[PDB]
Amino acid sequence: RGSFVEMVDNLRGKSGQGYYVEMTVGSPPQTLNILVDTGSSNFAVGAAPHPFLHRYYQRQLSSTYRDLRKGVYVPYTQGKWEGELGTDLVSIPHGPNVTVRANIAAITESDKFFINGSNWEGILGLAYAEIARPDDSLEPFFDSLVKQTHVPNLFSLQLCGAASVGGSMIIGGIDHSLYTGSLWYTPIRREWYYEVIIVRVEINGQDLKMDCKEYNYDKSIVDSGTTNLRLPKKVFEAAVKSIKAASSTEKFPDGFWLGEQLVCWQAGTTPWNIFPVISLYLMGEVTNQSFRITILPQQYLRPVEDVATSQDDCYKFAISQSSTGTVMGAVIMEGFYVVFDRARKRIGFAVSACHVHDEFRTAAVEGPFVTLDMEDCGYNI
Ligand SMILES: C[C@@]1(c2cc(NC(=O)c3ccc(Cl)cn3)ccc2F)CCSC(N)=N1
Ligand code: NA
Numbered sequence: 001r002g003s004f005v006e007m008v009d010n011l012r013g014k015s016g017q018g019y020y021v022e023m024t025v026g027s028p029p030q031t032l033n034i035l036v037d038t039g040s041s042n043f044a045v046g047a048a049p050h051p052f053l054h055r056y057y058q059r060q061l062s063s064t065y066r067d068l069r070k071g072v073y074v075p076y077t078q079g080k081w082e083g084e085l086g087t088d089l090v091s092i093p094h095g096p097n098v099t100v101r102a103n104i105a106a107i108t109e110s111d112k113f114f115i116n117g118s119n120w121e122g123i124l125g126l127a128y129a130e131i132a133r134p135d136d137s138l139e140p141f142f143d144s145l146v147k148q149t150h151v152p153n154l155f156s157l158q159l160c161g162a163a164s165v166g167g168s169m170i171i172g173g174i175d176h177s178l179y180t181g182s183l184w185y186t187p188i189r190r191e192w193y194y195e196v197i198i199v200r201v202e203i204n205g206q207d208l209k210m211d212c213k214e215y216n217y218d219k220s221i222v223d224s225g226t227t228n229l230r231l232p233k234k235v236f237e238a239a240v241k242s243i244k245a246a247s248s249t250e251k252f253p254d255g256f257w258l259g260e261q262l263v264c265w266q267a268g269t270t271p272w273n274i275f276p277v278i279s280l281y282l283m284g285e286v287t288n289q290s291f292r293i294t295i296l297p298q299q300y301l302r303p304v305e306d307v308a309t310s311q312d313d314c315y316k317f318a319i320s321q322s323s324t325g326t327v328m329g330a331v332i333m334e335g336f337y338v339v340f341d342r343a344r345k346r347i348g349f350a351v352s353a354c355h356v357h358d359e360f361r362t363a364a365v366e367g368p369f370v371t372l373d374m375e376d377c378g379y380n381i
Pocket of ligand 2: 079113
């Protein structure tokens, strides 16, 4: 407990492509890079020679493979995957020194799922059974890990960000060198997604003055598998209005705020200080008590390096409207060390020791604050 040197720096990735960890599947072990996803619950790996893939699960080479003789079809809002369910021995080279029999969805057909140019071949769904496909009987990997070993029912993520991103996934523990100050915990409202309740929203300290139910319509989640801070449409509308006002020194086209176009500045001449901080107050552990997390423009203005039609420093506005509730994606998580404390049904936030900042402002986790009617901020029906 407290320090896990061998798990430090076990995450890699590229900007806009997510964070992956090294895993082994089968006997003898087949090495795969696997996307770390707190927004889903399936362990699903490429099992066929899709041209975008560096490598894939070859079930014929594994003596420990077992067929569940069951298919699974997973459509998303944009794209799909389809696979054949089985079990095999799963290990994490730069994680705990254990081997687990886990459910594996062997991906045999997909559309807009794998990324052309990416270095990962599967997805580690770290959320709960309730949202597993096809149903809650298909035990998620981390549930299997805890059930079969003495690994504590907790993991933590330090996503570092801005061409190669890095970070740490501490399995079964917390590493105190990864954060500064104190951890503050928000209750997991329900174990399906990592669902949380946002009780107050500020832009540069200015409250948005909305019914706090709107902040969590229809849910708020912490999701390492999403880049953006995604806000419910009505919240997004009001947040951008306030961000527009706060950043009035320079004017930008309407399309930039909708993520329909990028904005470019000359190298090193990026004006961070004209852009406001964004604060989310989260439900605390105690009745009427809350805490505040605060991110910088460094988090919500993402560098886009892939532009060929431009030679400057171009950025995407990575706060976007949503119809699925608040998604606290990489835009949030890159500022913080995030502790998914499953044993105690809570999520901890602390200032990340690796987060990107200037000399005038840092990301912050602050409390305690007094907030009434926090239970009424959650959505029902
Ligand atoms: C299963 C799903 C998903 C996520 C991804 N993520 C990424 O590619 C990515 C990219 C950048 C960053 Cl920072 C993080 N992640 C890719 C394919 C997917 F099917 C469905 C959509 S939402 C979610 N939480 N999981
Ligand atoms: Na997708």
